[PDB]
């Protein structure tokens, strides 16, 4: 809920899932030898099958999508921006700061990000971006 | 397993402490402690710290990843205040 | 349609030369396997299998009995119309 | 208020929670196992995020500076478009007044339209013009999409053969040099920043002309509708008493000899965003309605294939010829904008969790075994292959003689060190093996004398005299 | 899949299937679905190396230097232990090695492994200097050496002087050794004449030798202006590199005198 | 004498019946540009060994007995020199190397899929492929550099 | 030149401390109190991180960062400052405090299993 | 040489040390016969007119002559 989103040991059933997901991804990225295999035709086809299977999944929209058919300066600004600007390239980049695109995968996809000194299984390098606020 | 830039000696004197040096190198060896070089004259080596002042981050330590490991006796207050963070060269100890 | 007898003579000349028991100098365009080349009867069965691998068509068991030399082996393949 | 920058430590935390429910939902969509509870949890999270966004719209209008800059740019663009539309309407009204002075009803209608525009605080004529231009552009895009779907059986395939950005900016430069006949880059980027919201058509028109090989400027009616729409839309002491804005003096003059490269980069950026909007809307048309092209009826495909054959015959013939009520609707508009922006948030969250689940499933799919190869015929080079490659073998030997053409041999396979050459003899199977059978006869004779004598081999376990344990593979036919 | 390989040539499709059949190779039992065992592969390597002459061994070592040597220079010993466990394909040894923390944590990272491409490119660049630029320099020096001397070739190609002379000597000795012909021993005496007089000495076993910095104890030519002018006038009247075709070697009017001077008595 | 330039050299090779593989100076291997290879050759020795081998005895390779002269210490010291070069890469003194087959075969399989569908040579091109998803083609192929235009701010007009 | 850039930076803090608004003066007092205690700037951390990401990005991302930040007056930062910031080891107790403040008992169980893995690697 | 003697004889200008070094190194770098015989004439003109003869000039004379030995040998082999 809304009260389960703040800090202070609230929302334990989903905070412990997220903290176990990032550690288990870090343990298989470093300590799993069987994942360092060059890809073959069984991997190349079935990943493209698994690429199209996730793309066939459509998100269930809510009831918001249903529709039918001296002014203030704040009220006239919302009506003028909706009619004159149908596509805004400046606001869609503000979404990238909120969603934080590739949050759990760019920790391992960057070039030279993780140092050699923190390449052990006891090391806590996936907790550097944790800010309590 | 020596490094020809840092792990060599300047003097001719044979102190015959190479067995204790390789024993302490095996003692300081860990999971990645065998990847770096072995210095037989590490007990006589004095590497000056080049960062006495600077930005002191809270989320980060004052130590670095690729730092030369100290001796059993080497403390950072041996070099005095007027010479702290000045020497760009590593020193070697010889006992008279 | 039918392959001429000039090329299939040279085709069956090369596959009999690469047999390890025979020599390359003993083989003539008119020669017998058991008499001239000095071959046991078990590898005469292996001779017609080399013809079944050179010419990919399967020779039947009754027609394999009728061939016993190289002049009959070059004659039987040239009459078979399914050869490429 | 959640999207304010003071609550960001909450915000991404909430996002991870939203991520987690999508982390099961697509999962419980892709196996089809009780996705209703995940949909209900996503609806509750969407209602909470809708309340957060309803507070955060005003909270980011008050605090966030990028939204204020976007609002100022949108207000300046709307004022420029309204000034251009008012100048065109004033020119039309001046022409109508110079043609006939008895225009009292037209003046009353113009006063009523000006009062309605002042009450709405916007130019309704420019809004209806932009709506009509976008509708005609969408109709032209749908017509060209169904024509490319039915005629050639393909859709939109963006590859390197298309019109690049340099050809696009050069085509726009020569187009507006055909329009005005005297121009610079500053006037071009000023016109493109003044328009800045009109949907461009010419790049997709050129791509469909390259795909269909027919002229499209005169034959369809939607192109002519877009063209006629683009036709009808196209003292000193007082200045001393006027205060000078210090913010304007910190910027250079636009007619400065140091700002040419900035204008070129602005032209490239505006052409890039125009081409990206064109690729966006054509890909939207190819994901919305081109999925039905694969499920289309056979009659609509076959008749259009006959039409394409008739067009090819016509092209061959052409080649032969050549040779209390306002506030409720305003609250509805505010709720529409808030639900639109929270759906824009949730779609980006959906794409992020979709690509992260794709990356984790691609991590998972590495350890699976490969495919089984189908059985082929046994590797055999016939005597006809030997006699067919004899001249190539001798030419490869001649090329292996000289060093300058040693690597220019056409047939060069390689093992570890050696280069394979063209074989001069057929490689057989049935003729070989005459020595191993005799060695096996001698070995089974000595092994029968061994079994009658009770002898053991060298110790197959890794003993001291044999450090590598060398074991013969125990075969079931070689049991005794 | 249609979108990945829409249109490519037949050499590309057979290269792709050759690559995919190379990487899908495993070592198990022959009847269990796998093509061969590890010991059969070791027997193939042993009897393949036995069937090579010295040219085949030379090409084998060149293939080691070009491809396998940078990968061995970059990879750690735990990485080649992992590769050995992948060769043997035993579940027992793989399960035994997966228990080790030092085996799993000390695996190599790909950004460090990307130096193998630059090292392989440098080794293949040196082999391209040798095998591809070599015969062109050999032809240009062997047709008209007075028109293209080794210093002209070293200036117009920019490799080195001694490297070009080593390329010429190696190419002539490689052409002689691969044809079962006794090599012309006078060629290092002709390309390294000053180096033959300076460096090549008879060396005894149980003692170390030195090198003379100068031949004579003399006064320098910078000490006086007249000695400086004499050195400059002598250097203008001198060559920089003398070869077999120059005017001091113009008294060799007979090929018998040519083989007498450069053969077996050049040190005398 | 003529033949110092490459046009006269190629004409003389045409008169001798030899088509030159190196027409101009940009097709010259230029061994002075090497940085890691002379550093390896200076300290330890020749990493090739069989580059100069007449009959099979002029090759420089470590001994098979082991110890300080064996293969393990030499490969360890070569790996230390490559580690010094890689530390020079990480601090920005050297450019970032391209993607090798050894580096790609040890990577995460999804990264191998992204590399083989993008055609990226350098990992910087892979970072541009991921951080700009609107840039690629419809088959996952990477678009060139000239087809991207960033937004220039008005604050450069001060 | 860094001292000139710091003068141009702290002119803004002096203007906000002498503006008269409550929020400007409180943020300027926060900046002064952070500078007097020796606490480093987060702007410098962002500058070092974006310089390293400009170094390790490809040419599209490099051109995007260079075109976004051409008008933003950034200090001329050497590569050695970015390498000095990057090569520092992270503090364990600060990470523990952040993981026990951001997350509650789940953070304590995660740190307990982390210390369990540490003592297992010690074995 | 034409502009050199036009500067010396007509305009009566005393040449500097750098333009003496240029006429030295031009005749030294040219592989024709008698180039050093005129470079030593320029050295004598530097000596008897008070122009400074630096040791770096002498080391560069030796280095440039040893470098232009290649051009001298090419112009001798062309004959």
Short mmCIF file of N, CA, C and O in Angstrom, two decimals, chain B residues 8-59:
data_model
loop_
_atom_site.label_atom_id
_atom_site.label_comp_id
_atom_site.label_asym_id
_atom_site.label_seq_id
_atom_site.Cartn_x
_atom_site.Cartn_y
_atom_site.Cartn_z
N UNK B 8 62.63 -5.29 -6.35
CA UNK B 8 64.07 -5.49 -6.33
C UNK B 8 64.69 -4.83 -5.10
O UNK B 8 64.03 -4.11 -4.35
N UNK B 9 65.97 -5.09 -4.90
CA UNK B 9 66.73 -4.52 -3.80
C UNK B 9 67.81 -3.58 -4.33
O UNK B 9 68.32 -3.77 -5.43
N UNK B 10 68.14 -2.58 -3.53
CA UNK B 10 69.17 -1.62 -3.89
C UNK B 10 70.56 -2.05 -3.42
O UNK B 10 71.55 -1.78 -4.11
N UNK B 11 70.64 -2.72 -2.28
CA UNK B 11 71.91 -3.03 -1.65
C UNK B 11 72.40 -4.42 -2.05
O UNK B 11 71.71 -5.19 -2.72
N UNK B 12 73.63 -4.72 -1.65
CA UNK B 12 74.23 -6.02 -1.90
C UNK B 12 74.06 -6.98 -0.73
O UNK B 12 74.35 -8.17 -0.89
N UNK B 13 73.60 -6.50 0.42
CA UNK B 13 73.64 -7.29 1.65
C UNK B 13 72.59 -8.40 1.62
O UNK B 13 71.42 -8.16 1.31
N UNK B 14 73.02 -9.61 1.95
CA UNK B 14 72.13 -10.76 2.06
C UNK B 14 71.75 -10.93 3.53
O UNK B 14 72.56 -11.41 4.33
N UNK B 15 70.53 -10.53 3.88
CA UNK B 15 70.05 -10.67 5.25
C UNK B 15 69.48 -12.05 5.53
O UNK B 15 69.20 -12.35 6.70
N UNK B 16 69.28 -12.87 4.49
CA UNK B 16 68.84 -14.27 4.58
C UNK B 16 67.48 -14.41 5.25
O UNK B 16 67.22 -15.39 5.96
N UNK B 17 66.59 -13.44 5.05
CA UNK B 17 65.23 -13.51 5.55
C UNK B 17 64.23 -13.74 4.42
O UNK B 17 63.11 -13.22 4.45
N UNK B 18 64.62 -14.51 3.40
CA UNK B 18 63.73 -14.81 2.29
C UNK B 18 62.72 -15.90 2.64
O UNK B 18 61.61 -15.90 2.10
N UNK B 19 63.08 -16.81 3.55
CA UNK B 19 62.15 -17.86 3.96
C UNK B 19 61.00 -17.29 4.79
O UNK B 19 59.84 -17.64 4.58
N UNK B 20 61.31 -16.39 5.73
CA UNK B 20 60.25 -15.72 6.48
C UNK B 20 59.45 -14.78 5.59
O UNK B 20 58.25 -14.59 5.82
N UNK B 21 60.07 -14.23 4.55
CA UNK B 21 59.35 -13.37 3.62
C UNK B 21 58.35 -14.16 2.78
O UNK B 21 57.22 -13.71 2.59
N UNK B 22 58.74 -15.34 2.29
CA UNK B 22 57.78 -16.14 1.53
C UNK B 22 56.75 -16.77 2.46
O UNK B 22 55.60 -16.99 2.06
N UNK B 23 57.10 -16.99 3.74
CA UNK B 23 56.11 -17.46 4.71
C UNK B 23 55.07 -16.39 5.00
O UNK B 23 53.87 -16.69 5.05
N UNK B 24 55.49 -15.14 5.15
CA UNK B 24 54.54 -14.05 5.35
C UNK B 24 53.77 -13.72 4.08
O UNK B 24 52.63 -13.24 4.17
N UNK B 25 54.35 -13.96 2.90
CA UNK B 25 53.60 -13.81 1.66
C UNK B 25 52.54 -14.88 1.51
O UNK B 25 51.45 -14.61 0.99
N UNK B 26 52.83 -16.11 1.95
CA UNK B 26 51.81 -17.16 1.96
C UNK B 26 50.77 -16.92 3.04
O UNK B 26 49.62 -17.33 2.89
N UNK B 27 51.17 -16.27 4.14
CA UNK B 27 50.22 -15.93 5.20
C UNK B 27 49.29 -14.81 4.78
O UNK B 27 48.11 -14.81 5.14
N UNK B 28 49.80 -13.84 4.01
CA UNK B 28 48.97 -12.77 3.48
C UNK B 28 48.26 -13.16 2.19
O UNK B 28 47.44 -12.38 1.70
N UNK B 29 48.56 -14.33 1.64
CA UNK B 29 47.84 -14.83 0.48
C UNK B 29 46.41 -15.21 0.86
O UNK B 29 46.18 -15.88 1.86
N UNK B 30 45.46 -14.77 0.04
CA UNK B 30 44.07 -15.11 0.26
C UNK B 30 43.46 -15.79 -0.95
O UNK B 30 44.08 -16.69 -1.54
N UNK B 31 42.26 -15.38 -1.32
CA UNK B 31 41.63 -15.93 -2.52
C UNK B 31 42.23 -15.31 -3.77
O UNK B 31 42.39 -15.99 -4.79
N UNK B 32 42.59 -14.03 -3.72
CA UNK B 32 43.26 -13.35 -4.82
C UNK B 32 44.66 -12.88 -4.44
O UNK B 32 45.28 -12.14 -5.21
N UNK B 33 45.17 -13.30 -3.28
CA UNK B 33 46.49 -12.90 -2.83
C UNK B 33 47.64 -13.55 -3.56
O UNK B 33 48.78 -13.13 -3.37
N UNK B 34 47.38 -14.58 -4.37
CA UNK B 34 48.41 -15.20 -5.18
C UNK B 34 48.54 -14.56 -6.56
O UNK B 34 49.48 -14.88 -7.29
N UNK B 35 47.61 -13.68 -6.93
CA UNK B 35 47.67 -13.09 -8.27
C UNK B 35 48.74 -12.02 -8.36
O UNK B 35 49.39 -11.87 -9.41
N UNK B 36 48.95 -11.25 -7.29
CA UNK B 36 49.95 -10.20 -7.33
C UNK B 36 51.35 -10.76 -7.06
O UNK B 36 51.53 -11.94 -6.77
N UNK B 37 52.34 -9.88 -7.15
CA UNK B 37 53.74 -10.27 -7.06
C UNK B 37 54.15 -10.51 -5.61
O UNK B 37 53.43 -10.18 -4.66
N UNK B 38 55.33 -11.10 -5.45
CA UNK B 38 55.91 -11.39 -4.14
C UNK B 38 57.17 -10.56 -3.98
O UNK B 38 58.06 -10.60 -4.84
N UNK B 39 57.25 -9.81 -2.89
CA UNK B 39 58.41 -8.97 -2.58
C UNK B 39 59.15 -9.60 -1.41
O UNK B 39 58.64 -9.62 -0.28
N UNK B 40 60.35 -10.12 -1.67
CA UNK B 40 61.16 -10.71 -0.61
C UNK B 40 61.72 -9.67 0.34
O UNK B 40 62.02 -9.99 1.50
N UNK B 41 61.88 -8.43 -0.12
CA UNK B 41 62.37 -7.33 0.71
C UNK B 41 61.25 -6.42 1.16
O UNK B 41 61.45 -5.21 1.34
N UNK B 42 60.05 -6.98 1.35
CA UNK B 42 58.90 -6.19 1.77
C UNK B 42 59.02 -5.76 3.23
O UNK B 42 58.42 -4.76 3.63
N UNK B 43 59.78 -6.51 4.03
CA UNK B 43 59.98 -6.14 5.43
C UNK B 43 60.85 -4.90 5.56
O UNK B 43 60.73 -4.16 6.54
N UNK B 44 61.72 -4.65 4.59
CA UNK B 44 62.59 -3.49 4.59
C UNK B 44 62.07 -2.36 3.72
O UNK B 44 62.75 -1.33 3.59
N UNK B 45 60.90 -2.51 3.12
CA UNK B 45 60.36 -1.53 2.19
C UNK B 45 59.53 -0.50 2.93
O UNK B 45 58.71 -0.84 3.79
N UNK B 46 59.73 0.77 2.59
CA UNK B 46 58.96 1.88 3.14
C UNK B 46 58.34 2.62 1.96
O UNK B 46 59.04 3.31 1.21
N UNK B 47 57.03 2.49 1.80
CA UNK B 47 56.29 3.16 0.74
C UNK B 47 55.59 4.37 1.35
O UNK B 47 54.72 4.19 2.22
N UNK B 48 55.93 5.59 0.96
CA UNK B 48 55.29 6.77 1.55
C UNK B 48 53.86 6.95 1.06
O UNK B 48 53.56 6.75 -0.12
N UNK B 49 52.98 7.31 1.98
CA UNK B 49 51.59 7.60 1.65
C UNK B 49 51.50 8.96 0.97
O UNK B 49 51.98 9.96 1.52
N UNK B 50 50.90 9.00 -0.21
CA UNK B 50 50.85 10.21 -1.01
C UNK B 50 49.58 11.03 -0.80
O UNK B 50 49.41 12.05 -1.47
N UNK B 51 48.68 10.61 0.09
CA UNK B 51 47.41 11.29 0.29
C UNK B 51 47.17 11.55 1.78
O UNK B 51 46.42 10.82 2.43
N UNK B 52 47.80 12.59 2.35
CA UNK B 52 47.48 12.94 3.73
C UNK B 52 46.22 13.80 3.85
O UNK B 52 45.52 13.73 4.86
N UNK B 53 45.94 14.60 2.82
CA UNK B 53 44.81 15.52 2.81
C UNK B 53 44.02 15.34 1.52
O UNK B 53 44.57 14.93 0.49
N UNK B 54 42.73 15.63 1.59
CA UNK B 54 41.89 15.56 0.41
C UNK B 54 40.42 15.45 0.80
O UNK B 54 40.03 15.80 1.91
N UNK B 55 39.63 14.96 -0.15
CA UNK B 55 38.22 14.71 0.10
C UNK B 55 38.05 13.45 0.95
O UNK B 55 38.56 12.38 0.60
N UNK B 56 37.35 13.59 2.07
CA UNK B 56 37.06 12.47 2.96
C UNK B 56 35.60 12.07 2.78
O UNK B 56 34.71 12.64 3.42
N UNK B 57 35.36 11.10 1.91
CA UNK B 57 34.01 10.62 1.67
C UNK B 57 33.52 9.78 2.85
O UNK B 57 34.31 9.11 3.52
N UNK B 58 32.22 9.84 3.10
CA UNK B 58 31.63 9.09 4.19
C UNK B 58 31.25 7.67 3.77
O UNK B 58 31.47 6.72 4.54
N UNK B 59 30.71 7.50 2.57
CA UNK B 59 30.34 6.18 2.07
C UNK B 59 31.55 5.36 1.65
O UNK B 59 31.42 4.14 1.50
#
